[PDB]
């Protein structure tokens, strides 16, 4: 059918899984010293940070949209 990731028994480069898992751990620690629950059903810190990031995105979008209206 398919081939799952298998390694039999007998350098350094960050994969996508290591980066995503590191960011999940760093969003579990920072939701452990802030919310004092590590269940991570919801996480409001990511909501605040993505709110500020979409604010910067709306700034960049309006700036480019005024650059084509210039």
């Amino acid at each position: 059918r398919s081939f799952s990731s298998r390694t039999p028994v007998n350098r350094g480069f960050v994969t996508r899984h290591q980066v995503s898992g590191w960011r999940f751990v760093m969003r579990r620690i920072a939701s452990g010293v802030a919310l004092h629950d590590t269940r991570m059903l919801v996480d409001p810190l990511r909501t605040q940070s993505r709110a500020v990031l979409t604010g910067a995105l709306i700034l960049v979008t309006g700036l480019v949209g005024c650059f084509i209206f210039s």
Binding site: A34, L35, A51, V52, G55, G62
Partner: protein, 438 residues
């Protein structure tokens, strides 16, 4: 019928084997001969025996610790006892010591803190108001003496050390501000001095006392440095300093716990590769230090939130307080204040919630003192009225514990709390004129 006991006589107890059912008038000379006035065998803390009663009459069993002592002069001394009921105030009369030498140390420490504060204030007023180079020399001398005092006593006291290091950053921040002549471009060096001294004294610290006063001054000094750098080199108005300061407060208030857990130096995750990692486990020497690092993380988080509030009021008082600025500034001020009040529904420590809910109070007080120091005296009464509404909405939530007890309503409150900091930075683009420059 033999009872073997230990008889105390220089207090070396021997081991004897007395006969039980004989009167003590014949046992006592042999005991005085073996071990060493009418002497008699008494139990410890008791009366001596009747000298003609046998040992299996009084009730001596194998293993008692008798003692040779003289018979008293007739009374039994019946060992009175007074029942007491509140003994915890006796021990509390022993911990509550008198004047002693442990009060002179606290008095001299408080007197030294008062010396450094008064010597900063007078010798700043001797340079700001009028005077020659004599004024700033005292500030620099007090600053360098207090730095070497707070760095020399870190191993002897560690409580007077952190107190001298907290007190040290008012003559440090005053020594570099009016040290260089000129004017402002002088808050760059003062912000650098208070940030550098707050980062030096955060190195050799215990678990607490690297609390909010150090990392809040560090993040506040770094933010004021990164804002005043854009004013020292370029030329920007008050509508850029306030925007950059409020934006910096929003940035390091939102990204506060990530920055805390990065700055706490936790035992970093050992997330492995999909190849052949087989990584070593965390040893038990670094796992037992963890309840110290959690407290350091909590103190750093409280300080980062407090520095974000101090920066978000430090530029909020520079956007609109000059003279009748644009209503985009009067929106950004209320937007940062209501945002820092809405973030208090997120956190769970009490000091972070207090510093976030006190941002509106600090904003009203700072706008009041900036309307007074700017000589307006008409919007100052309105800032006092806004402070009155703030104290009223504190009181209504306090004495009536139904309003302060939190399913679509909370979702709408969260939607407002995300809409405010989503719409802040576009209004920051409207305000400075960065849309109009393109």
């Amino acid at each position: 019928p033999i009872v073997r006991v230990a008889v105390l006589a220089g207090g070396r107890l021997t081991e004897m084997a007395l006969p039980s059912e004989l009167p003590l008038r014949e046992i006592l000379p042999a005991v005085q001969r073996i071990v060493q006035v009418r002497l008699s065998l008494a139990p410890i803390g008791g009366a001596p025996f009747s000298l003609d009663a046998t040992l299996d009459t009084v009730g001596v069993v194998d293993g008692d610790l008798l003692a040779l002592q003289a018979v008293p002069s007739g009374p039994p001394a019946p060992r009175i006892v007074e029942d007491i009921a509140d003994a915890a105030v006796i021990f509390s009369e022993a911990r509550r010591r008198q004047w002693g030498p442990t009060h002179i140390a606290r008095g001299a420490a408080l007197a030294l803190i008062g010396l450094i504060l008064v010597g900063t204030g007078l010798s700043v007023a001797h340079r700001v108001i009028t005077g020659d180079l004599l004024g700033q020399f005292i500030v620099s001398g007090i600053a360098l003496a207090t730095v070497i005092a707070a760095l020399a006593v870190r191993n002897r006291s560690a409580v007077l050390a952190t107190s001298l290091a907290v007190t040290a950053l008012v003559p440090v921040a005053a020594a570099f501000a009016l040290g260089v002549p000129g004017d402002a471009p002088n808050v760059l060096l003062a912000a650098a001095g208070v940030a550098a001294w707050s980062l030096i004294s955060m190195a050799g610290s215990p678990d607490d006392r690297g609390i909010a006063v150090f990392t809040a001054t560090a993040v506040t000094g770094v933010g004021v440095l990164l804002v005043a750098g854009a004013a020292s080199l370029w030329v920007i108005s008050s509508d850029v300093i306030g925007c950059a300061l409020v934006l910096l407060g929003l940035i390091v208030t939102v990204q506060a716990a990530q920055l805390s857990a990065m700055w706490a130096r936790f035992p970093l995750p050992v997330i492995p590769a999909p190849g052949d990692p087989t990584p070593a486990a965390r040893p038990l020497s670094v796992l037992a230090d963890l309840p110290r690092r959690v407290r350091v993380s909590q103190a750093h988080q409280t300080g980062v939130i407090a520095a974000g509030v101090l920066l978000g009021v430090a530029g909020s008082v520079a956007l609109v307080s000059s003279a009748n600025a644009s209503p985009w500034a009067w929106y950004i001020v209320v937007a940062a204040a209501a945002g820092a009040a809405l973030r208090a529904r997120v956190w769970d420590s009490a000091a972070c919630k207090a510093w976030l809910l006190g941002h509106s109070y600090l904003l009203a007080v700072a706008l009041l003192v900036a309307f007074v120091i700017g000589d307006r005296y008409q919007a100052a009464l309105w800032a006092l009225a806004a402070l009155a509404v703030l104290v009223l909405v504190w009181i209504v939530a306090a004495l009536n514990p139904k309003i302060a007890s939190p399913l679509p309503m909370r979702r709408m409150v969260g939607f407002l709390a995300t809409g405010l900091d989503a719409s802040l930075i576009p209004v920051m683009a409207l305000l400075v004129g960065l849309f109009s420059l393109v």
